[PDB]
Design a protein around this ligand. Sequence first.
Ligand SMILES: [Mg+2]
Length: 329
Amino acid sequence: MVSLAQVRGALCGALLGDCMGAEFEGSDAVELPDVLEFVRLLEKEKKAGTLFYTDDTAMTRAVIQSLIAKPDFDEVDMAKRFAEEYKKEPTRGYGAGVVQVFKKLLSPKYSDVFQPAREQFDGKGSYGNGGAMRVASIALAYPNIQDVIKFARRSAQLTHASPLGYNGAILQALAVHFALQGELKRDTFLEQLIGEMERIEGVKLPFCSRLKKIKEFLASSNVPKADIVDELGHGIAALESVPTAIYSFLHCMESDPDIPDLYNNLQRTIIYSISLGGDTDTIATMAGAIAGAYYGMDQVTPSWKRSCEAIVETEESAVKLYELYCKQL
Ligand SMILES: [Mg+2]
């Protein structure tokens, strides 16, 4: 049985990843000393809540409020919350055309809540990671894997209608789902994900191909960050960020010689994620969600979490998601 510590851990890990990754976003190369300096300063900062969250958390909050209000999953409700959240705080960091989806949802001219997303990228749909960045809560609320898959997909399709976008969301949700189930071995976890993605996807199995590359990298020694960036990616594309977040989580189950030992696994996961550069708040928010689900609140340290905008509201929302989970059993 999943614990409240795991549900809260996952949401706080997501929040930490967003808030701490945000300042580094877009850096083609990050200097790890800069990340470690930032962490040391953060820990000494007298004022609380100085790190603002981005679109990743804004949309996460909307997902959660929808699930709490409509526990059987209501995509119409969820789309409305996405669009209303954007309208309230439009400058949180939305990109890759996604605001056109919200503007169409807000207009009276669209009645099918999936149609705006289908029109993106000249009718091909978005393959960005915005579906995946906000999906962890689906795995926290719904214990049944079939529900996780179908609701991860539908929640993602509200904005991301390309199979790369929505299958990236499914993969992220599945990573959280399997991380909740207890102590894991890396290869077994990867086979769990590969087995599901083979069926879901089946160039033909792009996520499966990246997961197999992860397995190869974990079996290798001394893997430079540059090889991870080159082969898995650090981009806004779901295919170039969801596997990278999974790799970051699995890598950080063990010590990293470049990250001081005083950091716990979850802290290491966030630091390592950010150190890969690129889309740092989304890769760290996704890796942090998985790590939080796995290690729980015990590794969410006071000095880190107090730095984040909306930490109190996040911790409270976990209790309501946990209640949903319990009702599902
Ligand atoms: Mg963001």
